[PDB]
Design a protein around this ligand. Structure first.
Ligand code: HEM
Length: 152
């Protein structure tokens, strides 16, 4: 449950991401893959990436970062009213991709990390609070769908 003020912060921060969706998407995935190497194993199309240089050079990684952040942005713009947007993602990630909720925790923290990295001094305490709550909400609603499916 986010306040309207918190949602305003979320979408204000998102404006930073939208100015360079590919660049943000790329760094988020790289932070995920290098911080938690087991997550790379879930991607048949990225598991060949052995070095961070290779990750940085991959146009397809950037493409997927765009896909991921575009989807997340679509969800965030719904300000919590995201059942229709979220259900297919929970379903594909539980049943097809088999992504444990732990990895969604990982990518949530990676997003926070990247925002501070790209916008140091410009991602204030209040903005971080609001963004964190938004990502928790996202995670929590996926977790509900996971429980429904008995997916661990
Ligand atoms: C903000 C969090 C995330 C969002 C919004 C997101 C969104 C998406 C979307 C829109 C797709 C393509 C459509 C689909 O297959 O449902 C996708 C595919 C995929 N996602 Fe996620 N994802 C997220 C997190 C993750 C994480 C943390 C992992 C693994 C650690 C992951 C693994 C995958 C894989 C393996 C695919 C298929 C890629 C392919 O082979 O083309 N996702 N994701």
């Amino acid at each position: 449950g986010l306040s309207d003020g918190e949602w305003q912060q979320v979408l204000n921060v998102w404006g930073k991401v939208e100015a360079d969706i590919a660049g943000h998407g790329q760094e988020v995935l790289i932070r995920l893959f290098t911080g938690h190497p087991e997550t790379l194993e879930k991607f048949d199309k990225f598991k060949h990436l052995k070095t961070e240089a290779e990750m940085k050079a991959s146009e397809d990684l950037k493409k997927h970062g765009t896909v991921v952040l575009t989807a997340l942005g679509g969800i965030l713009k719904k300000k919590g009213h995201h059942e229709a947007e979220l259900k297919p993602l929970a379903q594909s990630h539980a049943t097809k991709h088999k992504i444990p909720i732990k990895y969604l925790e990982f990518i949530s923290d990676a997003i926070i990390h990247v925002l501070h990295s790209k916008h140091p001094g410009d991602f204030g305490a209040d903005a971080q609070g609001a963004m964190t709550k938004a990502l928790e909400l996202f995670r929590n609603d996926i977790a509900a769908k996971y429980k429904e499916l008995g997916f661990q």
